[PDB]
Amino acid sequence: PQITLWQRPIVTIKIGGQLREALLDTGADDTVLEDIDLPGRWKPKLIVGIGGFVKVRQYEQVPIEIAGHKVVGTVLIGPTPSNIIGRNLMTQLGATLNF
Amino acid sequence: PQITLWQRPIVTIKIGGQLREALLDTGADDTVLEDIDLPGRWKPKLIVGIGGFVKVRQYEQVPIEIAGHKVVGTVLIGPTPSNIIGRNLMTQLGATLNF
Ligand SMILES: CCCC[C@H](NC(=O)[C@H](C)NC(=O)[C@H](CCC(=O)O)NC(=O)[C@H](Cc1ccccc1)NC[C@H](CC(C)C)NC(=O)[C@@H](NC(=O)[C@@H](N)CCCNC(N)=[NH2+])C(C)C)C(N)=O
Ligand SMILES: [Cl-]
Ligand SMILES: [Cl-]
Ligand SMILES: [Cl-]
Ligand SMILES: [Cl-]
Ligand SMILES: [Cl-]
Ligand SMILES: [Cl-]
Ligand code: NA
């Protein structure tokens, strides 16, 4: 799609049967979801946001569907006021910003 | 321009006659800079991101030059890991996300 930015750019995502919504954030290096579970071991990571640091679980090479497009990449699970899709997965959609 | 997202989308902008770099940030409602003093009156606000909330000065009516356009808009000054250009200004460019 072509998405204008008058409202927040929210798309549907799906991870192993969990259907959720998330924000396309070109200021995010990484993808951070709160309302999802993923199986097995993770790597604990601290990440930086505008308001401070947060502890997340890092899961690698996760299959995920974003606005109906299947991609694979790292997903971080932890507290956030909004689910966020970062550049790590937006590059897999071939996303561009046009300005 | 049309840019991919393999790197951070960083651009130079002129804010109140001063040049700074900043990240084009579709997941930001607002434009937030930390390395700059602006003149005149402001109002105290708070922004929220991943880590929590930060106190900012809200400066309305700031002249800005960005991507060849001359615009007037609001800038929030306060502490941020990176300067960020949000949707308040991207919309004035007619910016879009495409994939
Ligand atoms: C004036 C007041 C009114 C509006 C005010 N609105 C806000 O507070 C809105 C919701 N907040 C936002 O839109 C803020 C930005 C600030 C702003 O726009 O004001 N956005 C954000 O903070 C969004 C995520 C988010 C989105 C929506 C809601 C909540 C959080 N992330 C932007 C942020 C920018 C980065 C440079 C630190 N990115 C990150 O936090 C990501 N972090 C990363 O990518 C890390 N690798 C670190 C990068 C550091 N870079 C560097 N050092 N150069 C993370 C998501 C993995 C309100 N109170 O409602
Ligand atoms: Cl919105
Ligand atoms: Cl969608
Ligand atoms: Cl495991
Ligand atoms: Cl980080
Ligand atoms: Cl603060
Ligand atoms: Cl504005
Ligand atoms: Na002014």
Side-chain angles (χ1 to χ4, degrees), chain B residues 72-74 88-89 92:
Chain B
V72 174
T74 294
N88 72 307
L89 302 182
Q92 300 195 235

mmCIF file of all heavy atoms in Angstrom, chain B residues 72-74 88-89 92, ligand 7:
data_model
loop_
_atom_site.group_PDB
_atom_site.id
_atom_site.type_symbol
_atom_site.label_atom_id
_atom_site.label_comp_id
_atom_site.label_asym_id
_atom_site.label_seq_id
_atom_site.Cartn_x
_atom_site.Cartn_y
_atom_site.Cartn_z
ATOM 1 N N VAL B 72 6.057 25.983 9.124
ATOM 2 C CA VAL B 72 5.980 26.389 10.499
ATOM 3 C C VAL B 72 5.288 25.369 11.270
ATOM 4 O O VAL B 72 4.207 24.889 10.869
ATOM 5 C CB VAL B 72 5.332 27.800 10.663
ATOM 6 C CG1 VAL B 72 5.138 28.103 12.105
ATOM 7 C CG2 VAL B 72 6.151 28.877 9.984
ATOM 8 N N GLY B 73 5.971 24.862 12.346
ATOM 9 C CA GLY B 73 5.332 23.895 13.152
ATOM 10 C C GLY B 73 5.905 23.814 14.572
ATOM 11 O O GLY B 73 6.644 24.716 15.009
ATOM 12 N N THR B 74 5.453 22.780 15.280
ATOM 13 C CA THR B 74 5.760 22.670 16.694
ATOM 14 C C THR B 74 6.975 21.760 16.837
ATOM 15 O O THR B 74 7.043 20.710 16.190
ATOM 16 C CB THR B 74 4.559 22.086 17.394
ATOM 17 O OG1 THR B 74 3.431 22.983 17.344
ATOM 18 C CG2 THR B 74 4.850 21.730 18.828
ATOM 19 N N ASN B 88 3.964 15.047 12.636
ATOM 20 C CA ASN B 88 3.525 16.421 12.530
ATOM 21 C C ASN B 88 4.166 17.160 11.399
ATOM 22 O O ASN B 88 3.503 18.032 10.750
ATOM 23 C CB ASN B 88 3.709 17.166 13.876
ATOM 24 C CG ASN B 88 5.154 17.465 14.211
ATOM 25 O OD1 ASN B 88 5.998 16.576 14.209
ATOM 26 N ND2 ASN B 88 5.445 18.723 14.503
ATOM 27 N N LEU B 89 5.437 16.928 11.177
ATOM 28 C CA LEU B 89 6.132 17.566 10.023
ATOM 29 C C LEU B 89 6.083 16.706 8.776
ATOM 30 O O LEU B 89 5.939 17.270 7.686
ATOM 31 C CB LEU B 89 7.603 17.901 10.344
ATOM 32 C CG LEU B 89 7.884 18.835 11.531
ATOM 33 C CD1 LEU B 89 9.314 19.135 11.732
ATOM 34 C CD2 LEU B 89 7.054 20.120 11.418
ATOM 35 N N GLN B 92 3.357 17.421 6.499
ATOM 36 C CA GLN B 92 3.441 18.691 5.726
ATOM 37 C C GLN B 92 4.230 18.533 4.492
ATOM 38 O O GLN B 92 4.091 19.383 3.579
ATOM 39 C CB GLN B 92 3.962 19.845 6.601
ATOM 40 C CG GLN B 92 3.105 20.183 7.845
ATOM 41 C CD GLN B 92 3.423 21.514 8.475
ATOM 42 O OE1 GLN B 92 3.716 21.653 9.662
ATOM 43 N NE2 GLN B 92 3.429 22.477 7.673
HETATM 44 CL CL CL C 7 3.218 21.011 13.875
#
